[PDB]
Amino acid sequence: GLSDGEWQQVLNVWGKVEADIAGHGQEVLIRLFTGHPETLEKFDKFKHLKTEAEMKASEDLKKHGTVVLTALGGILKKKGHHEAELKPLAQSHATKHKIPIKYLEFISDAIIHVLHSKHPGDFGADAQGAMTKALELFRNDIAAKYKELGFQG
Numbered sequence: 001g002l003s004d005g006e007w008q009q010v011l012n013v014w015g016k017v018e019a020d021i022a023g024h025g026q027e028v029l030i031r032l033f034t035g036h037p038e039t040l041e042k043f044d045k046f047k048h049l050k051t052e053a054e055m056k057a058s059e060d061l062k063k064h065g066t067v068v069l070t071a072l073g074g075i076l077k078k079k080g081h082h083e084a085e086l087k088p089l090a091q092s093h094a095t096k097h098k099i100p101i102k103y104l105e106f107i108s109d110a111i112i113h114v115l116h117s118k119h120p121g122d123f124g125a126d127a128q129g130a131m132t133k134a135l136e137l138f139r140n141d142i143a144a145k146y147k148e149l150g151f152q153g
């Protein structure tokens with residue numbers, strides 16, 4: 001797990017995201033979709049976004065970005081005691097949305113990239129280490145639920 005010091009770093013970094021949840025959410029999803037087009041296909045409502053300009057101009061994409069980061073933020077604030085919050089998310093993503101765990105790795109990487117992109121020089125090595133541990137814990141706990149369901153893709 002993460003140490004108290006690491007969780008404090010995670011939540012300090014998260015404060016940066018909370019100042020502009022929509023902007024961060026939008027950029028994380030655009031980073032995901034442009035770097036891994038196959039992920040866009042999992043969203044029937046975003047499949048029409050044929051270009052990054054259309055992605056940038058989509059208010060519904062920003063809306064979903066807000067939903068995604070709000071959910072992740074809720075989980076992070078639990079500092080690992082997130083079973084009740086994480087289980088339903090893991091189950092909807094495996095059973096309803098059919099999201100392979102690889103795509104969760106992709107979005108975790110996108111979050112780290114967006115943090116550096118929006119806060120260059122202000123997302124330190126310690127902060128990156130802590131946030132990475134938090135995202136890995138998140139991903140790994142979802143993976144355990146995916147294994148329970150026998151879900152691969």
Ligand code: HEM
Pocket residue numbers: 039040042043044045067068069071072088089092093097099103104107
């Ligand atoms: C940080 C990771 C993620 C978080 C916190 C997150 C959170 C959410 C939430 C809260 C919802 C709405 C409630 C629900 O259906 O469970 C949702 C819906 C959805 N998610 Fe995610 N998600 C994550 C990653 C992904 C990834 C990586 C994909 C696909 C590559 C994905 C695909 C979907 C789809 C298709 C929906 C339904 C969208 C719609 O048509 O309204 N999610 N997600």
Ligand SMILES: [O-]
Pocket residue numbers: 068
């Ligand atoms: O999502």
